[PDB]
Amino acid sequence: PSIWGDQFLIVDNQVEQGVEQIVKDLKKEVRQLLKEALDIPMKHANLLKLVDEIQRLGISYLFEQEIDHALQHIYETYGDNWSGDRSSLWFRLMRKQGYFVTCDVFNNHKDESGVFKQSLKNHVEGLLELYEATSMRVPGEIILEDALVFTQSHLSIIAKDTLSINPALSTEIQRALKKPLWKRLPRIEAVQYIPFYEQQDSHNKTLIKLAKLEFNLLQSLHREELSQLSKWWKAFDVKNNAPYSRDRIVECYFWALASRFEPQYSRARIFLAKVIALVTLIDDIYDAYGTYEELKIFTEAIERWSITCLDMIPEYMKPIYKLFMDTYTEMEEILAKEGKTNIFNCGKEFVKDFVRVLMVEAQWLNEGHIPTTEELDSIAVNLGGANLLTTTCYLGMSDIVTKEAFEWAVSEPPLLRYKGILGRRLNDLAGHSSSVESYMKEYNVSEEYAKNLLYKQVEDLWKDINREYLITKTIPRPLLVAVINLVHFLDVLYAEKDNFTRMGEEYKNLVKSLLVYPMSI
DSSP, rough: OOSSSTTTOOOOOOOTTTTHHHHHHHHHHHHHHHHHHSSGGGGGHHHHHHHHHHHHOOOOOGHHHHHHHHHHHHHHHHTTOOOOOOHHHHHHHHTTTTOOOOOOGGGGOOOOSSSGGGGGGHHHHHHHHHHHTTTTTTTHHHTHHHHHHHHHHHHHHHHHHHTTTTTHHHHHHHHHHHGGGGGSOOHHHHHHHHHHHHSTTTTTTTHHHHHHHHHHHHHHHHHHHHHHHHHHHHHOOOOHTTTTSSHHHHHHHHHHHHOOOOOGGGHHHHHHHHHHHHHHHHHHHIIIIOOOHHHHHHHHHHHHGGGGGGGGGGGHHHHHHHHHHHHHHHHHHHHHHHHHHHHHHHHHHHHHHHHHHHHHHHHHHHHHHHOOOOHHHHHHHHHHHHHHHHHHHHHHHHTTTTTTHHHHHHHHHHHHHHHHHHHHHHHHOOOOHHHHHHHHHHHHHOHHHHHHHHHHHHHHHHHHHHHHHHHHHOOOHHHHHHHHHHHHHHHHHSSSOOOTTTTHHHHHHHHHOOOHHHOOO
């Protein structure tokens, strides 16, 4: 059952008067800061720092043009040859922006003896910058594999030593060691970074005031979205209309919110959450409930994609097919009015593909066929929902979708394949040690060794995904960002258990920090 009750059903958006004025003035100040730092090359390191703070404070959506232009100008001016302060920051922000800069910049972090310089060890800020840069590494980048070992060991020591000297700094180092910035969802970083930034002695007062006010305003919008979604879901009366399924609208919304958290994507988030709810209902049918004969019929009904075939369908499945059809038809009509029927029809085929693969898995289970890692891998883009989630984002972001973006998805790009394989590995490893014990058999290895071997494959996949991210230019950047966020979300979803089907506690508290508790003042 859902642990949230009805707290999100109705929204109480209490807003303070004139906040719009405050925020507008604060905005003008931040633009000027960006302008001042971009205009003078000696301040370019300072510019990179300001961009990082805007991003981590969670308010990049207010300065999208300014940031993109700033990073573009930095890339145009220096290319691969940055040699100022904050070289580790430069490297990470460039790769985050999609520029595949090389590691050559890190050569000078090393001694004449060919080992990392002793002075790096005394500079916590520098160590953290270097550490965070390692998370952007692709396979085979030895200097970053080495930097990761180096920073981890020295940062662990520093965090222990600084506990009694500066406990907030100790905490910030430990937060990074537990999960690097790049892997953390942007909205989650904002909730955690805001209070650390605020307690820093040198912090920019304008930036933190804006970040906290905006955090609260955007949290209000997220609450508005979840209210609409909760009313939508309640109307469906799942208790009665599918008692065998999960009541998880909050969880569906939390997943959609990972894709893009920004105000610009409000309607896309809502649509995506509905599709995740549908997927959930449907997966629950192909998994526990439905008999093989019924599943074959439903699969066929989905192929027909018409309310007119509602009579060919098993009775318990009818309400689900009706919700499904109503939901997709509403989007179909929106896209038609926008002259984007071509886009809808493309998305439609991927929904069909999701259902067809559910049926394949149901055939195998029927036959008593155990699928090869190879067979699974070839089915990866579709099984885990990688294709469905991605293309649902396409439908939600119609205005920027191109033919090339659909051409790309139809390609079975490595990026989406990797997403599916990573999702399955993470899920196996947290409970669909059920997949771990079968691995001990194939290689005849202890549990300790097996876990390590599997962790290594996961780490490899993160690096493979990084490479694909930096190399993929055919899809509009905002959609590529949604994809990478969805990939990183897998780590939250399967962090300690399958948090969707169950609820580990760390997951509970992320939700509350995003949706329940407003920044103070």
